Design a protein around this motif. Structure first.
Motif, PDB file in Angstrom:
ATOM      1  N   UNK A 126       3.080  88.833  86.354  1.00  0.00           N
ATOM      2  CA  UNK A 126       1.932  89.165  87.204  1.00  0.00           C
ATOM      3  C   UNK A 126       2.119  88.627  88.615  1.00  0.00           C
ATOM      4  N   UNK A 169       1.330  71.309  86.638  1.00  0.00           N
ATOM      5  CA  UNK A 169       0.883  71.653  85.293  1.00  0.00           C
ATOM      6  C   UNK A 169       1.505  72.963  84.826  1.00  0.00           C
ATOM      7  N   UNK A 197       7.012  82.189  75.886  1.00  0.00           N
ATOM      8  CA  UNK A 197       8.120  82.904  75.261  1.00  0.00           C
ATOM      9  C   UNK A 197       9.150  83.336  76.297  1.00  0.00           C
ATOM     10  N   UNK A 198       8.700  83.971  77.380  1.00  0.00           N
ATOM     11  CA  UNK A 198       9.605  84.454  78.426  1.00  0.00           C
ATOM     12  C   UNK A 198       9.858  83.405  79.492  1.00  0.00           C
ATOM     13  N   UNK A 247      31.766  67.036  63.461  1.00  0.00           N
ATOM     14  CA  UNK A 247      31.883  68.477  63.663  1.00  0.00           C
ATOM     15  C   UNK A 247      32.426  68.788  65.051  1.00  0.00           C
ATOM     16  N   UNK A 265      33.659  55.989  64.611  1.00  0.00           N
ATOM     17  CA  UNK A 265      32.734  56.623  63.687  1.00  0.00           C
ATOM     18  C   UNK A 265      33.275  56.581  62.262  1.00  0.00           C
ATOM     19  N   UNK A 282      -3.243  73.141  90.002  1.00  0.00           N
ATOM     20  CA  UNK A 282      -3.887  72.779  88.743  1.00  0.00           C
ATOM     21  C   UNK A 282      -5.232  73.478  88.591  1.00  0.00           C
ATOM     22  N   UNK A 334      -4.815  76.878  87.368  1.00  0.00           N
ATOM     23  CA  UNK A 334      -3.968  76.953  86.182  1.00  0.00           C
ATOM     24  C   UNK A 334      -4.504  77.973  85.185  1.00  0.00           C
ATOM     25  N   UNK A 363      -3.424  85.499  83.000  1.00  0.00           N
ATOM     26  CA  UNK A 363      -2.634  86.688  83.301  1.00  0.00           C
ATOM     27  C   UNK A 363      -1.284  86.642  82.597  1.00  0.00           C
ATOM     28  N   UNK A 418       0.462  89.358  79.716  1.00  0.00           N
ATOM     29  CA  UNK A 418       1.750  89.995  79.958  1.00  0.00           C
ATOM     30  C   UNK A 418       2.866  89.413  79.097  1.00  0.00           C
ATOM     31  N   UNK A 423       5.661  89.193  76.459  1.00  0.00           N
ATOM     32  CA  UNK A 423       6.420  90.304  75.874  1.00  0.00           C
ATOM     33  C   UNK A 423       6.159  90.441  74.383  1.00  0.00           C
ATOM     34  N   UNK A 438      30.153  74.144  59.496  1.00  0.00           N
ATOM     35  CA  UNK A 438      30.909  72.896  59.443  1.00  0.00           C
ATOM     36  C   UNK A 438      30.005  71.711  59.127  1.00  0.00           C
ATOM     37  N   UNK A 439      28.813  71.673  59.726  1.00  0.00           N
ATOM     38  CA  UNK A 439      27.908  70.548  59.508  1.00  0.00           C
ATOM     39  C   UNK A 439      27.531  70.449  58.035  1.00  0.00           C
ATOM     40  N   UNK A 457      30.614  69.252  56.146  1.00  0.00           N
ATOM     41  CA  UNK A 457      30.852  67.838  56.416  1.00  0.00           C
ATOM     42  C   UNK A 457      29.847  66.962  55.679  1.00  0.00           C
ATOM     43  N   UNK A 496      35.267  53.025  59.059  1.00  0.00           N
ATOM     44  CA  UNK A 496      36.128  52.745  60.213  1.00  0.00           C
ATOM     45  C   UNK A 496      36.607  51.301  60.218  1.00  0.00           C
TER      46      UNK A 496
END
Lengths: 259, 237
Positions: A3, A27, A36-37, A150, A176, B34, B37, B43, B47, B49, B63-64, B67, B75
């Motif tokens: 918008x 804010x 989302x976008x 990994x 490790x 603010x 806001x 708006x 909009x 999506x 792999x995780x 593992x 060690x």
RNA sequence: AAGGAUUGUUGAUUUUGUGGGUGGUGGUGCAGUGAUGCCCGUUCUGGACGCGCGCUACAC
């Protein structure tokens, strides 16, 4: 197309973030992670134009609220690009203090950090200076052994490159509790440079950064390898050993007991 | 020089005012933003999506999990050379001797009381005491659970009384086995003292106070064989 | 501890206890490279004039 009211509001945010150094963030900026976008909203805020202080705060806000998959796009699309840009454009090729922290906050989520910062960097022409700065961030900050293993496993299969060796050694330097599978992969990685049919890795010149990495593996995991694996590694030193580091590695390998 | 400094001070103040003026403008934009806001948020929501991993991403997740299935290796530290170990040992000996010269110049149940240990070891033979006491330490190592340091610390006092208690008991029948226990228990006490010397020290003094109090009524009858042992153990520890 | 440790709403990144190493985005001189010789941060706030006469105290 957001918008028109939103664009002007966030266009003000883009101006806000350019000079922001302290205080409370806008804010509207703080609620971007929920949207989302975010990609469209973040773009109008000009991530390249974000001040170093904003980048540090943005990683905190976004890595925390978000899913693992989305956070990867952030670490790859914004933080990683900013990390490379600052090093390339700085006179001394150093990384800014705030950006240096931002990588640590990205490491708060290990899976996102590795697949968004580490693997893309090493696979996209990483340079030694980039590896040193990024590796130090990996060195100081804590990582899970499982996630680190990994990442260590992934690095080994990649073709030998100077940047790849730096990241491997630091992970080895972390001391490790590597899974038994990971130790074998490390052993295979070092074997592939021994002359035998073999690839160019047998004859490719090896820098000390390889030798230092191999010494660290011998120092810490000599007790976690089989006797046959020890024999192959010992042959590797005999064929590719360094003048001064090589004798030390042989001493460490021979001092380890077989699993 | 002073004129340059005044220009420098004026420049610093001038830039400081500019930063403050920007900050003054800075907060006003946030305040206006603010307030608007809700309108901006409304708006944006209208909009919003309408409602595949990389091959690299798929492999890493696989792999995780793999593992996680496999076992984990412990060690180890780098092995120090004999010369370095000898040098480090000599330095520690040189340090320890120096401070001494300065001081010269000025399932398994952990018994919190001595009686509890006897109940646990009541049915066990004399030669089995080193086995049971050692197991109690292993069963209650500091790492295993919180508070084990305190339980082991209390056990150190308990174990000391046991060593003195056994000496009081007649042992002429089986002197050899009794010899095989006191030294064994004392060796454990030496290891325990290294970590809980505070706890051991408190118990030792109280025995001295107890030693005095019993001497204040009985003379030599209060004194016993274990009493001699007790003074010996202090010398070791 | 997933029937929820920790995060500015999030999810094992942390929390508690017990052990535990390192000066290391160090700099600089040498031959990208070197077991390399030598040493060893961040943002705000403030920066009684002189002479001189007389008098008065200081001495068991």
């Amino acid at each position: 197309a957001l918008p028109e009211k939103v664009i002007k509001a966030y266009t003000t945010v883009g101006s806000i973030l350019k000079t922001w150094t302290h205080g409370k963030l806008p804010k509207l900026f703080k609620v971007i992670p929920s949207l989302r976008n975010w990609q469209d909203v973040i773009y109008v805020t000009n991530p390249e134009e974000w001040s170093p202080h904003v980048v540090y705060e943005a990683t905190k806000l976004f890595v925390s609220n978000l899913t693992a998959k989305e956070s990867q796009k952030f670490i790859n699309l914004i933080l990683l690009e900013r990390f490379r840009d600052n090093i390339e454009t700085s006179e001394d090729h150093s990384l800014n203090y705030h950006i240096y922290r931002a990588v640590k906050k990205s490491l708060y989520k290990p899976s996102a950090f590795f697949k968004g910062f580490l693997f893309p960097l090493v696979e996209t022409g990483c340079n030694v200076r980039e590896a040193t700065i990024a590796g130090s961030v990996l060195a100081k900050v804590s990582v899970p052994a499982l996630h680190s293993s990994a990442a260590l496993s992934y690095l080994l299969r990649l073709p030998f490159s100077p940047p790849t060796t730096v990241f491997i050694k630091i992970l080895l330097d972390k001391k490790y509790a590597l899974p038994y599978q990971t130790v074998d992969d490390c052993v295979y990685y070092f074997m592939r440079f021994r002359i035998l049919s073999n690839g160019e890795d047998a004859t490719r010149v090896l820098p000390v950064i390889w030798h230092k990495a191999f010494l660290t593996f011998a120092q810490r995991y000599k007790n976690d390898i089989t006797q046959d694996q020890r024999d192959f590694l010992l042959e590797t030193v005999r064929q590719r050993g360094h003048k001064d580091i090589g004798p030390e590695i042989r001493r460490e390998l021979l001092a380890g007991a077989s699993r | 020089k002073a004129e340059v400094m005044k220009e420098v001070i004026a420049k610093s103040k001038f830039y400081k005012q500019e930063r403050q003026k920007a900050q003054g403008i800075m907060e006003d934009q946030i305040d206006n933003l603010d307030d608007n806001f809700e309108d901006v948020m409304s708006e944006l929501m209208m909009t919003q999506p309408k409602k595949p991993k990389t091959d690299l991403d798929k492999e890493y997740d696989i792999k995780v999990k793999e593992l996680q299935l496999d076992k984990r290796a412990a060690p180890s530290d780098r092995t120090k050379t004999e010369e370095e170990k000898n040098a480090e040992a000599e330095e520690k000996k040189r340090e320890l001797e120096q401070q001494r010269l300065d001081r010269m110049n000025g399932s398994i149940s952990c018994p919190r009381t001595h009686d509890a240990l006897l109940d646990q070891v009541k049915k066990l033979d004399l030669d089995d005491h080193p086995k049971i006491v050692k197991n109690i330490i292993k069963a209650y190592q500091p790492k295993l659970a919180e508070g084990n340091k305190e339980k082991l610390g209390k056990f150190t006092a308990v174990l000391l009384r046991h060593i003195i208690f056994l000496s009081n008991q007649n042992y002429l029948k089986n002197v050899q086995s009794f010899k095989r226990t006191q030294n064994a228990l004392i060796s454990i006490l030496k290891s325990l003292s290294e970590k809980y010397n505070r706890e051991l020290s408190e118990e030792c003094r109280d025995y001295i106070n107890e030693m005095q109090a019993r001497y204040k009524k009985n003379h030599f009858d209060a004194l016993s064989n274990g009493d001699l042992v007790f003074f010996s153990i202090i010398g070791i520890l």
